[PDB]
Amino acid sequence: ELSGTVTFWDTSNEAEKATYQALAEGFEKEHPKVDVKYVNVPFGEANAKFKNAAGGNSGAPDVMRTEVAWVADFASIGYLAPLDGTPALDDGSDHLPQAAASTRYEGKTYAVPQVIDTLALFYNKELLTKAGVEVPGSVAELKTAAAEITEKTGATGLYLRGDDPYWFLPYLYGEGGDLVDEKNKTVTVDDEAGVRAYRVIKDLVDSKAAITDASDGWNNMQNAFKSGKVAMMVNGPWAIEDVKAGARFKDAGNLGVAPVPAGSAGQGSPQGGWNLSVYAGSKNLDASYAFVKYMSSAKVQQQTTEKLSLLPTRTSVYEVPSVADNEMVKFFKPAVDKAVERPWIAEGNALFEPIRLQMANVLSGETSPDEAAANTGDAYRKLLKDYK
């Protein structure tokens, strides 16, 4: 028997949330004595809100949509129920290895994978065609393309997200860099690749190839792309249905997607995504395990793709013709296969704030690329006491 309340905190965005609420409530079809209480929690607030609730054992959710870096974060402070040997885990081996890695902390499973993602270059096909340019493969090509776009159409080439540090990573990887060398416990962000990456973002804006904003970056990016103010943006699968709501991208026929541009050394995009965790203090652990199994099942992952084009973590789901033949999936899955995995460490989540501050200050001209890289390195060494 399953009965009682399962409160689910979902972080999905305005375009995704109706789908996720319907899926969550569908758990009640097979378990009518369970009451699913769906709550949508803003992404930026959710980590803090969960810690506040879990630390005061006061209004915590039973099931938490848990960003890949939040698993080790929450788990290290005891907020997550261990899932090994529980009904929450079913056909575990189906999940992509890199998705499974993010669910683990100190030899225990604290989450089940839900979606996997990476960043890509979205582009407005009509604008590029009008400008007579090809989708750019590199930053150098992007600069050239942007000039032609402005000359021939008046649009700016790129919206460069300046207020979210995750958007720094493609530039860092393209310059031949990474945050840390996990295996050797060495901070690497302040290597010359870090300097180069901060210089690249500043040059893109100064040269007018790109525009940016120091605040409200999600809305500003989406607005600029949807309104044709820019021809390109870097974004993820969570943006697809949001973009398609716009007059300019109905049915996605005008929406192109390609890999993030290479830099001077090579090319790369980060691995991200979401898992599902159970609050350690839940008063309905059984019903929660079953809710997690349900939300992470092949059936529900397939539905999510069909409604939202989010990428399944289950390998088996990619063999479903409906998923295999989805064009956003056909592009994003290979890109995900190549995505750079991060260290799944308690402090991994905290690696982002230092980038955020230095990136803002580079873009405004308050901080040189050289100082920004050094500052980011210093911040990491403070965070990671056993890293050189």
Ligand X SMILES: OC[C@H]1O[C@@H](O[C@H]2[C@H](O)[C@@H](O)[C@@H](O[C@H]3[C@H](O)[C@@H](O)[C@@H](O[C@H]4[C@H](O)[C@@H](O)[C@@H](O)O[C@@H]4CO)O[C@@H]3CO)O[C@@H]2CO)[C@H](O)[C@H](O)[C@@H]1O
Between 192-206 and 352-364, two packed helices, what is the crossing angle to 10 degrees?
40
Q: For the stretch 98-116, what's the b/e string if a residue is b when 16 or more beta carbons lie within 10 angstroms of its beta carbon?
A: bbbbbbbbeeebbbbbbbb
DSSP-assigned letters across all residues of 333-357: HHHHHHPBPPP--TTTGGGHHHHHH
Comparing CB distances to ligand X, the nearer of 12 and 86 is: 12
From the centroid of its chain, how far is CA 99?
A: 13
Among 8, 9, 27, 70, which residue sits at the site for ligand X (rule: CB under 6 A)? 70
- What's the closest the beta carbon of residue 30 comes to ligand X, in angstroms? 25
Number of residue whose CB is nearest ligand X: 272
Answer yes or no: are the C-beta atoms of 155 and 162 closer than 8 Å. Answer: no
- What's the closest the beta carbon of residue 71 comes to ligand X, in angstroms? 10
Residue numbers 271-330 binding ligand X by CB under 6 A: 272-273
Between 352-364 and 369-383, two packed helices, what is the crossing angle to 10 degrees?
160
Record the tokens describing residue 162, joined without a space. 């300046």
- What's the closest the beta carbon of residue 310 comes to ligand X, in angstroms? 8
Among 2, 7, 8, 12, which residue sits at the site for ligand X (rule: CB under 6 A)? 12
Among 285, 352, 361, 370, which residue sits at the site for ligand X (rule: CB under 6 A)? 352
Comparing CB distances to ligand X, the nearer of 6 and 179 is: 179
Residue 242 interacts with ligand X (CB under 6 A): yes or no: no
Residue 331 interacts with ligand X (CB under 6 A): yes or no: no
Among 69, 231, 335, 339, which residue sits at the site for ligand X (rule: CB under 6 A)? 69
Residue 358 interacts with ligand X (CB under 6 A): yes or no: no
Q: Which stretch binds ligand X (CB under 6 A): 64-72, 82-90, 198-206, 256-264?
A: 64-72
- What's the closest the beta carbon of residue 322 comes to ligand X, in angstroms? 21
Residue 117 interacts with ligand X (CB under 6 A): yes or no: yes
Number of H helices, E strands in the chain: 17, 15
Residue 27 interacts with ligand X (CB under 6 A): yes or no: no
Comparing CB distances to ligand X, the nearer of 117 and 178 is: 117
The residue type found at 245 is A
Please state, as a whole number, how many other Cβ atoms lie within 10 Å of the Cβ of residue 288. 30
Residue 43 interacts with ligand X (CB under 6 A): yes or no: yes
Among 238, 249, 294, 380, which residue sits at the site for ligand X (rule: CB under 6 A)? 238
Residue numbers 139-198 binding ligand X by CB under 6 A: 164-166
The residue type found at 84 is D
CB burial of residue 319 (10 Å; 0-12, 13-18, 19+): exposed
Among 16, 94, 190, 242, which residue sits at the site for ligand X (rule: CB under 6 A)? 16
- What's the closest the beta carbon of residue 141 comes to ligand X, in angstroms? 25
Q: Which stretch binds ligand X (CB under 6 A): 7-15, 194-202, 258-266, 321-329?
A: 7-15
Question: Which residues 6+ apart lie within 8 Å of 232 measured at CB?
Answer: 121, 122, 123, 124, 136, 142, 157, 158, 159, 225
Cα 84–Cα 295–Cα 20 angle in degrees, nearest 5: 145
Residue 44 interacts with ligand X (CB under 6 A): yes or no: yes
User: Which residues sit opposite 36 in a β-bridge?
Assistant: 6
Instruction: Name the DSSP class of 317.
Output: G
Number of residues assigned to the chain: 388
Among 6, 64, 68, 234, which residue sits at the site for ligand X (rule: CB under 6 A)? 68
Q: Which residues bind ligand X (CB under 6 A)?
A: 11-13, 16, 43-44, 47, 67-70, 117, 164-166, 218, 236, 238, 272-273, 349, 352
